[PDB]
């Protein structure tokens, strides 16, 4: 279970709908205020629950109903605005993870430096690489320095809400290591150079190669899901799409088990297309078996 929290108006519910309901980013600039702890469920199979506690109660805040819930929590997603209020939310977090770490030691603390819209690219390094300092300093007080901390650059209009939610939702996965391995080299007995599993209705990369990503490769593939899905939907009467660029780079998407989909960048270095596709297709059929076994 992912637990989404912050302080009112930050971005905890706009991204809760912009991602799982597959909503538009516009229709959230005037959304209301979800006080009730709403437990939604989106299925990346096995199903992943997402609650989103209302962002207040003066420094959460030890109780039978603060320990009850973190016992079932898998990772704590602390969203954190950046139109303002940069400083208090930090201490909020510090405490919130202080009690959290003695209820669940296996808990992963994930913080979103959210709302990073039109705000320069040197302004960003500013907020991040030292906001982390602000969070380590309060962790140098009543606590300890060594902790699971991770810092992303969500933007609900960017692609990176999805990249962040992926690197996150990917750690709460039963055998991330063998999915990644079996899609790593197990698909480097071919011309494929980058692979992504993908929920299609969302767009979080449920996994990727052991090659650290680069968002560029993430966008193409996701965007390619769109181009395939929108074109298909124009004429309804495998679910796969091959496309080739003028330098020869192929982009390939084939369907998997229940709204999942493989998308991979194939670099032929020289070999013809039909052969790349044949070898790739062979290993990919293997991978697909190594999915249905789950």
């Amino acid at each position: 279970m992912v637990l989404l929290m912050g302080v009112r108006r930050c971005g905890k519910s706009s991204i809760c709908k912009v991602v799982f309901h597959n909503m538009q980013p516009l229709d959230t600039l005037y959304l209301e205020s979800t006080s009730n702890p709403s437990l939604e469920h989106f299925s990346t199979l096995i199903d992943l629950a997402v609650m989103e506690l209302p962002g207040q109660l003066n420094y959460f805040e030890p109780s039978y109903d603060s320990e009850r819930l973190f016992k079932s929590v898998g990772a704590l997603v602390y969203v954190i605005d950046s139109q303002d209020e940069y400083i208090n939310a930090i201490t909020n977090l510090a405490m919130i993870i202080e009690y959290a770490y003695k209820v669940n030691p296996s808990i992963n603390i994930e913080v979103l430096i959210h709302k990073v819209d039109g705000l320069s690219e040197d302004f960003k390094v500013d907020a991040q690489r030292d906001i982390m300092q602000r969070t380590g300093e309060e962790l140098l007080e009543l606590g300890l320095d060594g902790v699971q901390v991770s810092f992303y650059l969500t933007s609900i209009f960017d692609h990176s809400i999805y990249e962040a939610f992926s690197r996150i939702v990917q750690k709460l996965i039963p055998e991330l290591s063998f999915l990644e391995n079996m899609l790593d080299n197990l698909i480097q007995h071919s011309k494929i150079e980058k692979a992504f599993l993908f929920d299609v209705n969302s767009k979080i990369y449920v996994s990727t190669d052991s090659n650290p990503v680069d968002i560029q490769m993430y966008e193409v593939c996701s965007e390619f899901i769109d181009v395939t899905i929108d074109l298909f939907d124009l004429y309804k009467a495998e679910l796969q799409n091959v496309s080739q660029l003028a330098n020869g780079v192929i982009i390939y998407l084939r369907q998997m088990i229940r709204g999942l989909a493989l998308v991979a960048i194939i670099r032929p270095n020289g070999t013809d297309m039909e052969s790349c596709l044949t070898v790739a297709d062979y290993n990919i059929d293997i991978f697909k078996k190594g999915l249905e076994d789950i």
């Binding site: 560029q216 490769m217 966008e219 193409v220 965007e223 390619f224 769109d226 181009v227 395939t228 929108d230 074109l231 298909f232 124009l234 004429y235 495998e238 679910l239 796969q240 799409n241 091959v242 496309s243 080739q244 660029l245 003028a246 330098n247 780079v249 982009i251 960048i265 039909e274």
Partner: protein, 289 residues
């Protein structure tokens, strides 16, 4: 002959530059906000279908510039026009002043270029709710169609247009096509190409802007949405530093370059013929046929 003057006139803020940027400058709708005001005419010599040069006169719409176009520069702005494309902000505060300048223009077209093609676009339509859109259009057109029929023009053609949907593509496809000389040919070769493939349908798209050139024959807005989807994808392939060349979807849809100036969107009747046979045919086809 192959060089066309296209006037893009209309009151300030109506969104004229925006359009130019999206269909011919790969601006995303968002991107368009930073476009400044246009000072007097801003010219563009765009190159379409390989040999056709479309010189877009994007006339600044502010009143300063605008009373110019009709007095001092009248013979300059209005001589040898092939196409007026007049655009109307629908959240416009002076609808009658707007139709006024439309008529001031149509007037000059009448002495100077009587043969000019007239199109109008009801623009910015995403700022009016769906239940009221068709009524806003129909009232509007009743007015313009007569304002225009009066000056030796209409039947007038107009479009409910927006930056935030596929409609811009329908409008500019219909607009820019009226300029293709080849048409008769393209259309016929397309027919022979559809017949060969036993194709459920084949659209032909100018390659670089992705306007629909001609279709071979359910959802009646398919063509413009394919221009849109394709144009997004085209921009996306930028992330790998190379140009889209082919795409095949299922065994159903095939999209590929023809000349360095067209693209063909082929959709087959079923999904059960193999690659080989299909992929052969498209080879000619091609430039030749």
């Amino acid at each position: 002959p192959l060089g066309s003057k296209l006037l893009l006139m209309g009151r300030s803020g109506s969104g004229k530059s925006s359009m130019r940027s999206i269909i011919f400058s790969n601006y995303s709708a968002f991107d368009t906000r930073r476009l400044g005001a246009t000072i007097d005419v801003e010219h563009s010599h765009l190159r379409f279908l390989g040999n056709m040069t479309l010189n877009l006169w994007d006339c600044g719409g502010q009143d300063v510039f605008m009373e110019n176009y009709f007095t001092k520069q009248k013979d300059h702005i209005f001589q040898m026009v092939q196409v007026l494309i007049h655009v109307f902000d629908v959240e416009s505060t002076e609808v009658l002043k707007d139709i006024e300048i439309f008529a001031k223009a149509l007037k000059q077209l009448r002495k100077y270029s009587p043969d000019a093609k007239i199109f109008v676009l009801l623009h910015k339509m995403d700022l009016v709710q769906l239940d009221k859109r068709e009524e806003l259009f129909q009232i509007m057109m009743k007015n313009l169609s007569e304002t225009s029929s009066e000056f030796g023009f209409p039947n007038l053609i107009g479009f409910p247009t927006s930056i935030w949907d596929e409609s811009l593509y329908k409008a500019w496809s219909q607009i820019v096509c009226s300029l293709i000389p080849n048409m008769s040919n393209h259309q016929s070769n397309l027919k022979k190409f559809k017949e060969i493939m036993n194709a459920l349908e084949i659209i032909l798209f100018e390659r670089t802007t992705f306007l629909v050139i001609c279709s071979s024959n359910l959802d009646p807005k398919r063509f413009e949405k394919i221009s849109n989807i394709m144009k997004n994808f085209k921009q996306s392939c930028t992330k790998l530093k190379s140009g889209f060349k082919t795409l095949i979807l299922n065994n159903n849809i095939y999209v590929s370059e023809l000349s360095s100036n067209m693209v063909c969107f082929i959709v087959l009747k079923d999904m059960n013929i193999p690659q080989e046979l299909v992929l052969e045919n498209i080879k000619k086809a091609k430039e030749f046929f």
